[PDB]
Amino acid sequence: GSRRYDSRTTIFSPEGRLYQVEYALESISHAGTAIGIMASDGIVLAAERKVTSTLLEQDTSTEKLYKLNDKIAVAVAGLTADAEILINTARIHAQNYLKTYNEDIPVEILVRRLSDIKQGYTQHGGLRPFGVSFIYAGYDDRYGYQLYTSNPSGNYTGWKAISVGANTSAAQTLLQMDYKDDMKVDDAIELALKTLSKTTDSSALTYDRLEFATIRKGANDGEVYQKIFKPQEIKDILVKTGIT
Amino acid sequence: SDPSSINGGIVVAMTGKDCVAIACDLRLGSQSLGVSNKFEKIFHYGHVFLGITGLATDVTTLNEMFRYKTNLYKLKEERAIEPETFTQLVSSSLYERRFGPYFVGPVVAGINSKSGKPFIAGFDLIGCIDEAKDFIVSGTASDQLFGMCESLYEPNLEPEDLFETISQALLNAADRDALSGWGAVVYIIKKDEVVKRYLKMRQD
Amino acid sequence: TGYDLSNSVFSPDGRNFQVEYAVKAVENGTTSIGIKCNDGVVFAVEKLITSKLLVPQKNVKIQVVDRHIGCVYSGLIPDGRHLVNRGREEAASFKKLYKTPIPIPAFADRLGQYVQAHTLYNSVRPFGVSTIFGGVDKNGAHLYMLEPSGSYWGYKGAATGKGRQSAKAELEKLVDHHPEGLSAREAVKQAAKIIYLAHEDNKEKDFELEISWCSLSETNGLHKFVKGDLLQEAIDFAQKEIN
Amino acid sequence: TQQPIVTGTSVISMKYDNGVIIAADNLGSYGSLLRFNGVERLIPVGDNTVVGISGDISDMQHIERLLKDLVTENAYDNPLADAEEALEPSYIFEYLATVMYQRRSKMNPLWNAIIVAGVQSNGDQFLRYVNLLGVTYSSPTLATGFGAHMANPLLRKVVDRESDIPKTTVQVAEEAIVNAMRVLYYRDARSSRNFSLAIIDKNTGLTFKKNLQVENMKWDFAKD
Amino acid sequence: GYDRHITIFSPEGRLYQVEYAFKATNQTNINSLAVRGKDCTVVISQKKVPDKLLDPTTVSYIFCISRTIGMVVNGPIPDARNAALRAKAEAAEFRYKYGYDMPCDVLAKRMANLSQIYTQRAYMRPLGVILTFVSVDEELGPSIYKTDPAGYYVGYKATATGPKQQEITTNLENHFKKSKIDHINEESWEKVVEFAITHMIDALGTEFSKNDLEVGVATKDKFFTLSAENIEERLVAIAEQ
Amino acid sequence: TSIMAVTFKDGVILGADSRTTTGAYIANRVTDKLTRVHDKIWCCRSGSAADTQAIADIVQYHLELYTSQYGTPSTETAASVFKELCYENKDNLTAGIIVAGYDDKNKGEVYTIPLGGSVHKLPYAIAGSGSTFIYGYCDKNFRENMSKEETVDFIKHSLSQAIKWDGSSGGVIRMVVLTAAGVERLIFYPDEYEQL
Amino acid sequence: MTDRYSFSLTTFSPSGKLGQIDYALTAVKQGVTSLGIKATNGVVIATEKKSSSPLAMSETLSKVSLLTPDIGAVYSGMGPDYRVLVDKSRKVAHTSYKRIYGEYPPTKLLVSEVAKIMQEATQSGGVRPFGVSLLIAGHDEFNGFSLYQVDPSGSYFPWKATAIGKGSVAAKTFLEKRWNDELELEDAIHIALLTLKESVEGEFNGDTIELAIIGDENPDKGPRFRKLTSQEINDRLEAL
Amino acid sequence: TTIAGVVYKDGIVLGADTRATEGMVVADKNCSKIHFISPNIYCCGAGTAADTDMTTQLISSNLELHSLSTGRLPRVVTANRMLKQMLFRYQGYIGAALVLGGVDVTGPHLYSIYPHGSTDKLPYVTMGSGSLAAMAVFEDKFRPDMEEEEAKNLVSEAIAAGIFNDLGSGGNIDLCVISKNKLDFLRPYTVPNKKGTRLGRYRCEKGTTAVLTEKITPL
Numbered sequence A: 001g002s003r004r005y006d007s008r009t010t011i012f013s014p015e016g017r018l019y020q021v022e023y024a025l026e027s028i029s030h031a032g033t034a035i036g037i038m039a040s041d042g043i044v045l046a047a048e049r050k051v052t053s054t055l056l057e058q059d060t061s062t063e064k065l066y067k068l069n070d071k072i073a074v075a076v077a078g079l080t081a082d083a084e085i086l087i088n089t090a091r092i093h094a095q096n097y098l099k100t101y102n103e104d105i106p107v108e109i110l111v112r113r114l115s116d117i118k119q120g121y122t123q124h125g126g127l128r129p130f131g132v133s134f135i136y137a138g139y140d141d142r143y144g145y146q147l148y149t150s151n152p153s154g155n156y157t158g159w160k161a162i163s164v165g166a167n168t169s170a171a172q173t174l175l176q177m178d179y180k181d182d183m184k185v186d187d188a189i190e191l192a193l194k195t196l197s198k199t200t201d202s203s204a205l206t207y208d209r210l211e212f213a214t215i216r217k218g219a220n221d222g223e224v225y226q227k228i229f230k231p232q233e234i235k236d237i238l239v240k241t242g243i244t
Numbered sequence B: 001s002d003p004s005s006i007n008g009g010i011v012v013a014m015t016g017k018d019c020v021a022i023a024c025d026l027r028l029g030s031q032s033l034g035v036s037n038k039f040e041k042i043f044h045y046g047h048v049f050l051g052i053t054g055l056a057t058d059v060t061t062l063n064e065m066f067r068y069k070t071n072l073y074k075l076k077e078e079r080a081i082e083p084e085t086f087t088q089l090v091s092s093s094l095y096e097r098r099f100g101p102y103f104v105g106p107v108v109a110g111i112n113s114k115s116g117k118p119f120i121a122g123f124d125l126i127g128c129i130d131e132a133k134d135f136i137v138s139g140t141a142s143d144q145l146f147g148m149c150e151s152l153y154e155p156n157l158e159p160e161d162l163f164e165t166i167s168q169a170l171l172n173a174a175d176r177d178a179l180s181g182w183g184a185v186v187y188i189i190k191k192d193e194v195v196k197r198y199l200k201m202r203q204d
Numbered sequence C: 001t002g003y004d005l006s007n008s009v010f011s012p013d014g015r016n017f018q019v020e021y022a023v024k025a026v027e028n029g030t031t032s033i034g035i036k037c038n039d040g041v042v043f044a045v046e047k048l049i050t051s052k053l054l055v056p057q058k059n060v061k062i063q064v065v066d067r068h069i070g071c072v073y074s075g076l077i078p079d080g081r082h083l084v085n086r087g088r089e090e091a092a093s094f095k096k097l098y099k100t101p102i103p104i105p106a107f108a109d110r111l112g113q114y115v116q117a118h119t120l121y122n123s124v125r126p127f128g129v130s131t132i133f134g135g136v137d138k139n140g141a142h143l144y145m146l147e148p149s150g151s152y153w154g155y156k157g158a159a160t161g162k163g164r165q166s167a168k169a170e171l172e173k174l175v176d177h178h179p180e181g182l183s184a185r186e187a188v189k190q191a192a193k194i195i196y197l198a199h200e201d202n203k204e205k206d207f208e209l210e211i212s213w214c215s216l217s218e219t220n221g222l223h224k225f226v227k228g229d230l231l232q233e234a235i236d237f238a239q240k241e242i243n
Numbered sequence D: 001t002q003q004p005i006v007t008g009t010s011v012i013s014m015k016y017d018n019g020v021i022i023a024a025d026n027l028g029s030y031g032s033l034l035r036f037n038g039v040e041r042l043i044p045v046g047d048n049t050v051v052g053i054s055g056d057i058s059d060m061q062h063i064e065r066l067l068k069d070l071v072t073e074n075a076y077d078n079p080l081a082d083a084e085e086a087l088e089p090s091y092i093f094e095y096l097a098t099v100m101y102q103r104r105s106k107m108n109p110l111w112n113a114i115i116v117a118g119v120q121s122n123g124d125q126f127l128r129y130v131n132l133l134g135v136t137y138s139s140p141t142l143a144t145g146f147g148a149h150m151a152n153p154l155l156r157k158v159v160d161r162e163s164d165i166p167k168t169t170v171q172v173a174e175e176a177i178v179n180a181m182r183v184l185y186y187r188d189a190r191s192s193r194n195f196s197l198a199i200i201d202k203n204t205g206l207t208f209k210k211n212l213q214v215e216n217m218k219w220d221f222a223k224d
Numbered sequence E: 001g002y003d004r005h006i007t008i009f010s011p012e013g014r015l016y017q018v019e020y021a022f023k024a025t026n027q028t029n030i031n032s033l034a035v036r037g038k039d040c041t042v043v044i045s046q047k048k049v050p051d052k053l054l055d056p057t058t059v060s061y062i063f064c065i066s067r068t069i070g071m072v073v074n075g076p077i078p079d080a081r082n083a084a085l086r087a088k089a090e091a092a093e094f095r096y097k098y099g100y101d102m103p104c105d106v107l108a109k110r111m112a113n114l115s116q117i118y119t120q121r122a123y124m125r126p127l128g129v130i131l132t133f134v135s136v137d138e139e140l141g142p143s144i145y146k147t148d149p150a151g152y153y154v155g156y157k158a159t160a161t162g163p164k165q166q167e168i169t170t171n172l173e174n175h176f177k178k179s180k181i182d183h184i185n186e187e188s189w190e191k192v193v194e195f196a197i198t199h200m201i202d203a204l205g206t207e208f209s210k211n212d213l214e215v216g217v218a219t220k221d222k223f224f225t226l227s228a229e230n231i232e233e234r235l236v237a238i239a240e241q
Numbered sequence F: 001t002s003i004m005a006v007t008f009k010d011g012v013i014l015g016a017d018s019r020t021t022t023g024a025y026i027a028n029r030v031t032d033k034l035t036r037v038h039d040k041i042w043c044c045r046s047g048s049a050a051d052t053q054a055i056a057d058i059v060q061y062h063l064e065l066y067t068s069q070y071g072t073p074s075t076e077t078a079a080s081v082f083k084e085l086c087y088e089n090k091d092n093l094t095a096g097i098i099v100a101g102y103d104d105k106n107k108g109e110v111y112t113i114p115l116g117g118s119v120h121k122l123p124y125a126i127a128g129s130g131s132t133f134i135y136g137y138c139d140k141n142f143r144e145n146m147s148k149e150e151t152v153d154f155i156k157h158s159l160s161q162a163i164k165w166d167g168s169s170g171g172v173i174r175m176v177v178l179t180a181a182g183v184e185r186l187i188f189y190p191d192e193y194e195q196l
Numbered sequence G: 001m002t003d004r005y006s007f008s009l010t011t012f013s014p015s016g017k018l019g020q021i022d023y024a025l026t027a028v029k030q031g032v033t034s035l036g037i038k039a040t041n042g043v044v045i046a047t048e049k050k051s052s053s054p055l056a057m058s059e060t061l062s063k064v065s066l067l068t069p070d071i072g073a074v075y076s077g078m079g080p081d082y083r084v085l086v087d088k089s090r091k092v093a094h095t096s097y098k099r100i101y102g103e104y105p106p107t108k109l110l111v112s113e114v115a116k117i118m119q120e121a122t123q124s125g126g127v128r129p130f131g132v133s134l135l136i137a138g139h140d141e142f143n144g145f146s147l148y149q150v151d152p153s154g155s156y157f158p159w160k161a162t163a164i165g166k167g168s169v170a171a172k173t174f175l176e177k178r179w180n181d182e183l184e185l186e187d188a189i190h191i192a193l194l195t196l197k198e199s200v201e202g203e204f205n206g207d208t209i210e211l212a213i214i215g216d217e218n219p220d221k222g223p224r225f226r227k228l229t230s231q232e233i234n235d236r237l238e239a240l
Numbered sequence H: 001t002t003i004a005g006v007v008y009k010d011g012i013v014l015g016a017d018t019r020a021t022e023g024m025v026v027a028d029k030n031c032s033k034i035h036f037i038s039p040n041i042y043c044c045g046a047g048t049a050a051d052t053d054m055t056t057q058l059i060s061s062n063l064e065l066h067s068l069s070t071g072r073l074p075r076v077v078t079a080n081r082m083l084k085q086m087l088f089r090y091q092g093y094i095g096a097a098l099v100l101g102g103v104d105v106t107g108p109h110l111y112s113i114y115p116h117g118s119t120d121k122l123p124y125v126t127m128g129s130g131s132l133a134a135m136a137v138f139e140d141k142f143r144p145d146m147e148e149e150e151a152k153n154l155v156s157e158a159i160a161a162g163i164f165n166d167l168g169s170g171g172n173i174d175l176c177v178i179s180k181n182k183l184d185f186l187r188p189y190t191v192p193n194k195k196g197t198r199l200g201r202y203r204c205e206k207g208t209t210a211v212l213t214e215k216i217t218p219l
């Protein structure tokens, strides 16, 4: 029968690792680097696009930074299509929670949910896991500003600064070196871009190879605003910080 | 017994010159017993306003449902829903409960952000669209509102002329209905400002 | 290679080796035949007497479908029974809806499509039987033979099992020597002979002859087993021809 | 739940010394309209059983097909289908009884009253009733619907208890049945003159008589 | 090498089970041809009855799908009959749901979409058949549409299928290069059948008797297959000129 | 409705009025109640128009698919398909259908399927609301093996009376003749049949 | 019959590759060249009608498909796979969008829906990925003109201009030189015909080329999708 | 509602009034009841307005998908079947009463479809509460093979009969003329009633209404 052709995606190796999770992480290690940095007055999400031609329409393009609700965004590293499946599930969970309790979903609860979905693919069903790692940038009125990551295993953790995708080893050392707890958004913007500028496999870091976003409470009357940066704005912030 | 007239209340909407107005009373009751005088029946999803009369549990449920749907719409489309599009969404959503309907009388109001055209619409409980330019009425004093609107209304009113028209239409209709009144709200909606006014009316 | 390990896999030839392996089980079985006559059909089969302990005339191989169709098969006997059970369900549903008893060509395709379905998936095994069947319908007599692949055709005579080549040669002589046709009682006698001649390929053990027939004149278009005097008359005719 | 539309009236029957007799008129009524005058309501099964059916005719036709199908099915892989493993009256009855009670229990009954008359392997007379409720009973005389009220009283005067069955000849029994069919024709508004009668004897086998008529009709006292 | 056993991609981007199903197509060793007239579509196919014990009337690879649609199959008979039964069912369902007779191309596309599913889903094997559908469509006129195990389908001016398809194809190509029209400019179907048979004789280099051919003809509002005697009449007319 | 099918020497003729009412309103006065399920197997429809239309379409489908596989179906087979639908869905249907057809073997055949879902094979059949009024007339005037002209006159006279007395019936008398010769449609207007 | 293939046939290899997606992309590479170019007042999509036989009527085989009145699609790779994506794209544009909102979906969202279907064939039990890459051109009121590519993985990217299949590497280089942000639709059609001539071996005319545009409304609106006729292509080939 | 259709020489003329009622009250005096099915097929709607609207839209949508797959214009019989089979399945609970008219490859066809799933194929039909008023006009004046402007007048006259004599019907007269060469969607064809002129201005002057509080938010 069919047993002959079954890869068995949900088994342990003799060492006690999940083959497909490990190989999915290997996939994600080749994806464009995404960085999240949490400041006292906001969060920065920066991410590097990949391959890019001069003919790619950048202003209508979204491969890295996605919006889950008005308070929570994600940076993606891995299969974009796999991410979009999970993103739309998350977007629904947030609205189910809003409908039930008449309050916006707390960031951790959303993150756990998605992470639990990812976990399920590693323990049952016989399907391949999602080849995606998320950085979640969000705000709620319990914990304030929060950064999390999840990976194909379904494990998630909280961070002050973090990278996913390519060159995370190098990126995490550079962040660990220059990050400080009293840091502000404008400084974190600069740190994020400087880290990508050194870890990039491209010759130089330009506006057309970047997606960029900030979650600031820095708004009138203490309300959270998500800013997905336009191509021209990423170009301006690259000149301001002195990279180009 | 009749679900559309347990809780009571009304909504009316009108068009003017480069503006729309939508208004509602504030009553919620259990038939004869008045319970709340802070039960607003007008909601908004971006720049599109939705009034809903009828069974209050369904009014609440539908508001929550259209908030849900319009939020996902905005995330996917990367723009706020327009009145024309929303009207169709309401109709769809009502008709998918054709044989177990929401006991409601919805009313859409808003200005199309691109064309600038003032828009209103109304529905029966199963989603048939009343698509009239002049005015839309709904609730336990709908007959009363139809009469008031037909005699008071005229086209192309300026925002503060239209306010006086819709307010007098609501107030005088509500005062001839046992299950409407207990306060009232009037939204005057323009292309980039919305004025919300609470009206002084008799509290019986 | 590996193309023969799984059913419904095309080899590089364009063949389904599992079906061809089912044919080997069919070729391993006892001899069964079918003869189309003037107004009907005759079926006969070789039943190997493995032991003296077998009760004579009790282990019946030929099966009836509806009241007008006879089925006989060579190979894996249970697979044949399974196919006949399905046939009976098909014939029953046909009669329930359309009132008339199932026509033989209609019935042939019902078995055909079902057997062919067991070559479409790796989760099932092909049928280990070639099935000779037929009867009398409104358009007269029909004889069919159905292979593990789902292939079937109409026949003047049919033969399958270990003695098929021997039988086929004898059937071909009858087709040549009787263009105007063979009578039902003649076909019973000839069937007996052909099973007796085809027994030379299974000559180690002795055997038991079993014959059935549908004929418009001799059985009113209903399937009946050849019994008693008519069976003995056919055995005597067969025994005379080998000597 | 339905309602019966085209209907058949009384089926009547009795035991006698060697076998059983059963009879039923050839009418399919459509309410008060005497719609179909050529309806056979005695349906033989093999050469040892006759199933007489009253009530809804569409449901009778369904049961007719079930019995026809039962014969086909019993023949399958059965070398003794015309001998020791042929269908018995008791088997045919029990099947029908099972069906009738199953159908009432799903609230979707076959809207009939049935009498299975036959002779068993060992020569025993079989006569048993079943209806739309699955209710079953046996008696030396059995009759459905209207015949229960008028035929049984007459037939019971011939065979009043079990001990009268050996004393009753086939002639006496057939006369009684035909007499009863006359009485029913005078008095049942939904009956007809034309009927069928079936004798199942342990010696002479199944005799099926068609196109019989009620005769010797007393009307002369009307003129006064 | 399990990429050759089920319908998944090989490293070259190839589905070997689809390719091997195409080879099963020629296992019968039969050549078919289809051409269009003005008022008709004619399909002819080789008939080979190797066994004398066979009833030759039951040996057929032409199928009457609906009254308007005919289908000839190149491939083994069990898969041919699988395909035939389904096409019949689909054509009947179509007429019930949509109230008009299923067009030839709409059936071809439908059967092609089903064939595609077997190339993408692993548990189903492709059928080892090429299906040539013919009709006189009430909108498009004389129609020839062909389906294969890949799930490909396309309309034809004329076509040929089988082991010696390339010979027949080039013969037909050369004729339409001369005439400079998409059809056989002929009033009667009887003469279009004569054309079809003649051009198969020339291409294959073999003479035919009445029992070596099998013919199907589509006209407006009916498709029908010719008897042995109808073909014999057709062969007499060819010989006499 | 007034409908009938009558066997005769050369085959069978179906006949029907053309009136369809919604209460007292005549919604359609030119209704075609004789519907084709196969070349030479037709039916007369009475009862719910929605039900008899839905059934006749399903039967047409079944017989089309029968024909694709097993060749021309018998009139008995058509009647069996009608019955199967009417009997199994008796609780949700109001259909009284007469099935009529011409084989060459069996010649003309008429099957009636009343409300129950029972089948009755008859030399002729009458049905519909207007049929009550002509049981007397039809029983007295029907003979077997009539000629085509006699059978047309028998149906014309019968339905003429059915129409006269039944308000639910009326309009034109349509007929469909089924013989070896083919299928002939006849129509007869009020000015013709009323003066009979 | 049990569909026992409830497990993924596309899995991660030790290197992190998804074999079946890569192999599907190899199938796309072997397919015939198709391209898309975006102008200021329109979009053009084009491909070669590679006729399998001269007896075949290549007009019946449409490589360029209308998905909605304002959205068109072309492909490179396996035709039968494309056909069933076009069917589902057309259907999803009604079920999940038009029957809800009373209007057709914008280009990007229809693209996203197609991408989803393709992704699911990359992860669901018992299926191979689709062996096609799509180029979807379209217009909608709030986004204007747009051009998207969709790959077997489910990944999609918006393009100013691009090409896929056989001679895509050479074609993309050709387009990079010629493209600017001030092209009119006629200029883009001209460039599309030049670019496509490089990858075509044999006959190059209106009968062997399929070319459609998303442009002005052709007379509630008119449809912006328009397939150019065999004559309309040949006219522009004289000014080539 | 008064909806009607006739078959004329070159094609089909459909007609409808424009009054939408909730009980005894008029909600819309100029509503559209002639619905689009396909470019060559339209559908007049009566009965439960929501059922009419969503049944025509669903079949229109499915026919659009059907027509994209086949590449040819859809037929009226297929529109008729799809409406019929759906309405039948729902046993009259979808209260759609349609006049379906269009022009095929096989010529012009006109149907009446009823909520329970019956359809009549006819040269002229009327539906809605004003069907008897409209049908009287057709029985009085219809003849087969009319010219275009004559058929337009007859339908317009039949809808008018409904407008005036039936209380459920009113407002303007919409027509839809369908032939092989054109589709003319005439809305409104006629305005048989002028809107009643008001003699006084009852609009209140600014500051007349009593306000408690106010809030302004920009967008």
Ligand SMILES: *[C@@H](CS(C)(=O)=O)[C@H](Cc1ccc(CN)cc1)NC(=O)[C@H](CC1CCCCC1)NC(=O)[C@H](CC(C)C)NC(=O)c1cnc(C)s1
Pocket: B123, B124, B125, B126, B128, B129, B130, H001, H002, H019, H020, H021, H022, H023, H027, H031, H032, H033, H045, H046, H047, H048, H049, H050, H052, H053, H127, H128, H129, H130, H168, H169
């Ligand atoms: C005339 C048909 S009539 C008088 O012969 O029944 C119109 C037809 C029509 C068609 C399309 C459009 C626009 N999409 C408008 C009008 N039908 C009506 O006006 C409906 C008549 C009702 C009669 C009583 C039984 C229900 C149907 N009216 C409605 O459908 C209204 C919707 C309007 C726009 C407010 N709905 C109701 O009155 C309902 C009350 N309760 C319901 C569950 S629906």
Ligand SMILES: [Cl-]
Pocket: E109, E110, E113, E114
């Ligand atoms: Cl399909």
Ligand SMILES: [Mg+2]
Pocket: B174, B175, B176, B177, B178, B179, B180, B181, B182, B204
């Ligand atoms: Mg009050």
Ligand SMILES: [Mg+2]
Pocket: E006, E007, E118, E119, E120, E121, E122, E123, E124, E125, E126
């Ligand atoms: Mg497969």
Ligand SMILES: [Mg+2]
Pocket: F163, F164, F165, F166, F167, F168, F169, F170, F171
């Ligand atoms: Mg009358």
